[PDB]
């Protein structure tokens, strides 16, 4: 009964920890493409440092919110991404990587001084509000509603969940809770032909119908994934850990 209470709190909070949808148009010197390169790198950084997937989902939330309010020139975009990932590791990790290793993986592009100082600025700009809801926090809850649990479905919905991180357009216009429903349903329909279950229509208030806009963007992403310029998520999701589900065939249609 503290479970239903958390779902409710997260649904309130995911609206307040939301970035401004078209913030990238107001960024004079950076673009969605530059962002999607930085996010794909942070995946590679997650893997080397064996960071949690949540650490990555939080770092992106921090990056997007920071860029919603601060102009960043391209030569500084990797420093925002580095500082956010260090902040997210400090919050979510048992063993956060030390600063001098975040420096190493930038290849001395930036000093310790600069990483530490951007962490202070990032904290300032996010007003220390780092306990943000993520797609993965909704996914893990959705997974308790499987009939029955299926490790191919879990890893596929996670995989799909990560693909949304890369592409600000059109995912930034969807709430984490909604992306995580799209992801869950699409992974389920892909692996078992089953759909968004009743138990979650009650829990979430989300009809299969209401998920349709996001689920059609996420279908496309899924389809066009092997051709996308960012490929670190497909590499990561080949390891046996994730039941190599990035090797599976997207469905052609959803019968929607």
């Amino acid at each position: 009964d503290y479970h239903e209470d958390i779902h409710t709190y997260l649904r309130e909070m995911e609206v307040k920890c939301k970035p401004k949808v078209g913030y990238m148009k107001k960024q004079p010197d950076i673009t969605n493409s530059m962002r999607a390169i930085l996010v794909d790198w942070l995946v590679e950084v997650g893997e080397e440092y064996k960071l949690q997937n949540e650490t990555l989902h939080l770092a992106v939330n921090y990056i997007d919110r920071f860029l919603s309010s601060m102009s960043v020139l391209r030569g500084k975009l990797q420093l925002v991404g580095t500082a956010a990932m260090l902040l997210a590791s400090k919050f979510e990790e048992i063993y956060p990587p030390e600063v001098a290793e975040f420096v190493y993986i930038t290849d001395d592009t930036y000093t310790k001084k600069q990483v530490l100082r951007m962490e202070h600025l990032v904290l300032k700009v996010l007003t220390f509000d780092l306990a943000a809801p993520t797609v993965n926090q909704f996914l893990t809850q959705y997974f308790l509603h499987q009939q029955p649990a299926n490790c191919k479905v879990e890893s596929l919905a996670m995989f799909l969940g990560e693909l949304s991180l890369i592409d600000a357009d059109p995912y930034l216009k969807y709430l984490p809770s909604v992306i995580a429903g799209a992801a869950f349903h699409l992974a389920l329909y892909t692996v078992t032909g089953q759909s968004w279950p009743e138990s979650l229509i009650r829990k979430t208030g989300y009809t299969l119908e209401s998920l349709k806009p996001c689920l059609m963007d996420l279908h496309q992403t899924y389809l066009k994934a092997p051709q996308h310029a960012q490929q670190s998520i497909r590499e990561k999701y080949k390891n046996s850990k994730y039941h190599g589900v990035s090797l599976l065939n997207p469905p052609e249609t959803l019968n929607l």
Binding site: D1, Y2, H3, D5, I6, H7, Y9, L10, M13, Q52, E54, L86, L87, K90, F91, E92, E93, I94, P96, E98, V99, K112, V115, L116, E119, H120, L123, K124, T127, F128, D129, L130, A131, Q137, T140, Q141, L144
Partner: protein, 292 residues
């Protein structure tokens, strides 16, 4: 930091120095938590405490009032309380804490903890030294430095969390997973410590702490706690003590207090009582807010 006048150094808790200070313009009395930075940046203790307490506004949870960064200093500005539950129990060692105040204090703690849990926060260091009292008969959870935002369902988090005496058995046995029951265990321990004014399980090693628990509640078996005997740090060599009768464990305590404490110290974490359910227990039918 020019608006605050230091009055005295209060002490040190889970991290940093704490000062009593006065706001020179408003007169307000605060507790300042100083954190020095040297050279990994802002400690994860501070990052978690600040971010979580900003989402934990409750009358039974101490208030974060401001965060200040000056050169190589971080000050968290907090509501002040003149007393902790430990020193209050030391003063009351000979006398006793009046039963209705034991009840008020436990009630309040469960209200504060239920709010934490429903906001996906584990405290993970509940003990009398982190629970603060004022003169109006109010008690409050403090020091969220060792707290954490948890998920549904929980991942594996840090092992050897919680001060030994207040640490739940599923931690000592090295369960991969722990959640909110850990916090209920601690308040179980603190409930009985209010009743008897001595610590229930004062171990000096992890094995001694376990053996104190087993001596009192009985060595658990695959019936009491399904899974226990194949947990990482379970040894089948452990002595089998039978369960001591609670009227001996907490002599002062009525049938309703005993029922609650029992359910707060359930071995199996899945059957151990939640804060919300504990608040609804008959022991709290007749509860008031008396004064120390």
């Amino acid at each position: 930091m020019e608006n605050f006048q230091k009055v005295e150094k209060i002490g040190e808790g889970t991290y940093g120095v704490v000062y009593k200070a006065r706001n020179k313009l408003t007169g307000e009395v605060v507790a300042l938590k100083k954190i020095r930075l040297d050279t990994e940046g802002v400690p994860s203790t501070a990052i978690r405490e600040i971010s979580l307490l900003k989402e934990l506004n409750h009358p039974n949870i101490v208030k974060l009032l401001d965060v200040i960064h000056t050169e190589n200093k971080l000050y968290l500005v907090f509501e002040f309380l003149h007393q902790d539950l430990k020193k209050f129990m030391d003063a009351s060692a000979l006398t006793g804490i009046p039963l209705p105040l034991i009840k008020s204090y436990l009630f309040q703690l469960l209200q504060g903890l239920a709010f934490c849990h429903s906001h996906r926060v584990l405290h993970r260091d509940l003990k009398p030294q982190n629970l603060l009292i004022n003169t109006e008969g109010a008690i409050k959870l403090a020091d969220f430095g060792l707290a954490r935002a948890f998920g549904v369902p929980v991942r594996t988090y840090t092992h050897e969390v919680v001060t030994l005496w207040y640490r739940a058995p599923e931690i000592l046995l090295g369960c991969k997973y722990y959640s909110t029951a850990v916090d209920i265990w601690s308040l179980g321990c603190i409930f009985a410590e209010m009743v008897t004014r001595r610590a229930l399980f004062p171990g000096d090693s992890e094995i001694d702490q376990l053996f104190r628990i087993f001596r009192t509640l009985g060595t658990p078996d695959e019936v009491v706690w399904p899974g226990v005997t194949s947990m990482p740090d379970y040894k089948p060599s452990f002595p089998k003590w039978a369960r001591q009768d609670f009227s001996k464990v907490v002599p002062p305590l009525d049938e309703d207090g005993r029922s609650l404490l029992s359910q707060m110290l359930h071995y199996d974490p899945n059957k151990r009582i939640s804060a919300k359910a504990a608040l609804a227990h008959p022991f709290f039918q007749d509860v008031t807010k008396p004064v120390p």
